[PDB]
Amino acid sequence: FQSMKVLLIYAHPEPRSLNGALKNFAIRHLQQAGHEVQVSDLYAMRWKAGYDADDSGAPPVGEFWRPTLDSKQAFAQGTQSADIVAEQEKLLWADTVIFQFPLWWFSMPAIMKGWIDRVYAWGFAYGVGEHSDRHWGDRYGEGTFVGKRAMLIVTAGGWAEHYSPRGINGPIDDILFPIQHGMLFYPGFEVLPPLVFYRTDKTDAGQFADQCAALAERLDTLWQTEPIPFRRQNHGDYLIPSLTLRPELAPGQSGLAVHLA
Amino acid sequence: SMKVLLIYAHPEPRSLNGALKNFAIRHLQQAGHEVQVSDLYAMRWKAGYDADDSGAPPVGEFWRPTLDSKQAFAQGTQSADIVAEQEKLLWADTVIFQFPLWWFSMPAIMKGWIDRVYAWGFAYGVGEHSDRHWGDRYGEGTFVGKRAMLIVTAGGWAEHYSPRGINGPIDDILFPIQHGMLFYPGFEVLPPLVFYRTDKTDAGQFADQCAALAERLDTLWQTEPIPFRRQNHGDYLIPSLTLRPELAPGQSGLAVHLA
Numbered sequence A: 001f002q003s004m005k006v007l008l009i010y011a012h013p014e015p016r017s018l019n020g021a022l023k024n025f026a027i028r029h030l031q032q033a034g035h036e037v038q039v040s041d042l043y044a045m046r047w048k049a050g051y052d053a054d055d056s057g058a059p060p061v062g063e064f065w066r067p068t069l070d071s072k073q074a075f076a077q078g079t080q081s082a083d084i085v086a087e088q089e090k091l092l093w094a095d096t097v098i099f100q101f102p103l104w105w106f107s108m109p110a111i112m113k114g115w116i117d118r119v120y121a122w123g124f125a126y127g128v129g130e131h132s133d134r135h136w137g138d139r140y141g142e143g144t145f146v147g148k149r150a151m152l153i154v155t156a157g158g159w160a161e162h163y164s165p166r167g168i169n170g171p172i173d174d175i176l177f178p179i180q181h182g183m184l185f186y187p188g189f190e191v192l193p194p195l196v197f198y199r200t201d202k203t204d205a206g207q208f209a210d211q212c213a214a215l216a217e218r219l220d221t222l223w224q225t226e227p228i229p230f231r232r233q234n235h236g237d238y239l240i241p242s243l244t245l246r247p248e249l250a251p252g253q254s255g256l257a258v259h260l261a
Numbered sequence B: 001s002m003k004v005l006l007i008y009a010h011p012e013p014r015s016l017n018g019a020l021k022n023f024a025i026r027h028l029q030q031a032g033h034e035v036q037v038s039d040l041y042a043m044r045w046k047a048g049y050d051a052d053d054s055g056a057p058p059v060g061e062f063w064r065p066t067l068d069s070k071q072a073f074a075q076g077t078q079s080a081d082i083v084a085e086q087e088k089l090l091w092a093d094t095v096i097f098q099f100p101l102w103w104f105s106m107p108a109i110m111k112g113w114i115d116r117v118y119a120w121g122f123a124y125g126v127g128e129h130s131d132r133h134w135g136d137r138y139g140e141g142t143f144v145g146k147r148a149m150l151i152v153t154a155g156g157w158a159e160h161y162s163p164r165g166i167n168g169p170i171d172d173i174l175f176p177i178q179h180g181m182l183f184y185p186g187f188e189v190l191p192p193l194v195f196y197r198t199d200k201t202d203a204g205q206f207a208d209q210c211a212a213l214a215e216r217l218d219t220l221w222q223t224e225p226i227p228f229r230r231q232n233h234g235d236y237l238i239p240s241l242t243l244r245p246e247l248a249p250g251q252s253g254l255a256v257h258l259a
């Protein structure tokens, strides 16, 4: 068989919302298939969003507290706040991590961004590895999360056409790049194509049934779907330390698309 | 003599950001401008938008982030912290958002200012939806006539944000903010001020940051805005909201939204 360990990070303030419905569907679907599921329901946990000096469990390491170096010490010395530590343990436990949220101002809800900011410590999600001739940190297809898969599940009010290649909001995959490339591929996840639902504010029973069918199909194929083929940083595709794509790859092109093989 | 609102997100007053914030405030005041500040961490800003913000029971069967904002804003029941920020915004001619880049985006506390202040009736959901207009947004809206600018500190190098740099081009990474959050409700958006390699800033580097910052501040009403395209004034097909085919012909992606 092979029972997978799935962690769902979920950001919506109302349990009877569309998002709440889809969350409950996904959790039941995965449990019925034989997988184990842990959930971080950020609003239910009253998750603290603003990273600050109370998270480091120690006085400042230098003359004044620094978001970076104070994390580096807290993580290395074992003083981080206990909420942080429990999330980090969930991530280490999981084989697959799913982030589920409504699109709010073209980005994660604040409370979810605060999960990123606080959980992704120095020594854990960044700051790991050497800086040398041909290696510039353990990131972008390397890091703590190598071997794990991640996927977003996003609901949006705008129409699909509004997120099309010439659509005014920007192409969906480019708007999601800071998340999928910067937050998921960065600490070493294999990132699956996102599941994005459009025109969600008017969802009725028939649209919901369509959403559920699409969701179940993604959840059934989590370990078969091909990841987004983002380029690794440290294995020849980029010049180091400029971290620019070598001239023979995607020649004469620039922008977000050059980072896909 | 201009009215400038600074929205500022950093937890430590002695930080590099705190030093830049103080410099900017003093520089603007010495020039004769009036400055209001929203120091989010100092105010203990609530970041998570929820039902406690709408000041009333749910308008329908269960609270909805959209419709309960529409009603709170229309009926005057939003939480007082929100109202006070909306008042600042209406007061200001120029709004500056100052933050360290954290995970290629604003700190959560600032994202939560956006999520909670930008109400239905204020920043979105205003106006006609038809075949000729699709909401008062993207170069139209409540903020038309105001200017906005980002001031961003990043740890990564400039080259890492270059057009072929691994983190993505800086202006593409900042698109959801500049186009999605600032141009959307009607600001003219000035080019961002972005400082790189900030974790190693020394006296010399700080002097260079200060000089760049002063220069931007001295030109806030002279600098040309980012030439983003208005949604409703002919560049786009409505309601598909796709750029009309003779403009940037054959091209696609974020760059087609600038003329």
Ligand SMILES: Cc1cc2nc3c(=O)[nH]c(=O)nc-3n(C[C@H](O)[C@H](O)[C@H](O)COP(=O)(O)OP(=O)(O)OC[C@H]3O[C@@H](n4cnc5c(N)ncnc54)[C@H](O)[C@@H]3O)c2cc1C
Residues within 6 Å of the ligand: A012, A016, A017, A018, A019, A020, A021, A102, A103, A104, A105, A106, A107, A155, A156, A157, A158, A159, A200, A201, A202, A203, A204, A205, A208, B064, B065, B066, B115
């Ligand atoms: C602050 C904010 C910013 C936003 N920014 C953007 C943006 O940048 N881009 C964008 O495209 N959109 C944006 N939106 C819209 C947003 O993405 C949608 O409102 C959100 O995705 C809807 O999901 P929800 O869970 O909140 O839906 P809810 O409002 O809870 O519900 C939506 C509909 O689904 C129905 N529903 C619930 N459960 C069921 C069921 N079981 N069967 C059938 N129907 C069901 C509901 O009755 C309701 O009609 C924004 C909204 C807010 C509040």
Ligand SMILES: Cc1cc2nc3c(=O)[nH]c(=O)nc-3n(C[C@H](O)[C@H](O)[C@H](O)COP(=O)(O)OP(=O)(O)OC[C@H]3O[C@@H](n4cnc5c(N)ncnc54)[C@H](O)[C@@H]3O)c2cc1C
Residues within 6 Å of the ligand: A066, A067, A068, A117, B010, B014, B015, B016, B017, B018, B019, B100, B101, B102, B103, B104, B105, B153, B154, B155, B156, B157, B198, B199, B200, B201, B202, B203, B206
């Ligand atoms: C959670 C997190 C996520 C991050 N993600 C990203 C990312 O996605 N992209 C990226 O590029 N970067 C990233 N960074 C790096 C971040 O952008 C930088 O740490 C930040 O810009 C530094 O600004 P600060 O105010 O926190 O600096 P501080 O840490 O306060 O100070 C930085 C340096 O400036 C010096 N300094 C302060 N005042 C002065 C002065 N008056 N004169 C001379 N020197 C001065 C300090 O001594 C210190 O060396 C991340 C950092 C964190 C904590």
Ligand SMILES: [Cl-]
Residues within 6 Å of the ligand: A125, A126, A127, A128, A137, A138, A139
């Ligand atoms: Cl790193």
Ligand SMILES: [Cl-]
Residues within 6 Å of the ligand: B123, B124, B125, B126, B134, B135, B136, B137
């Ligand atoms: Cl709108």
Ligand SMILES: [Cl-]
Residues within 6 Å of the ligand: B244, B245, B246, B247
């Ligand atoms: Cl045309």
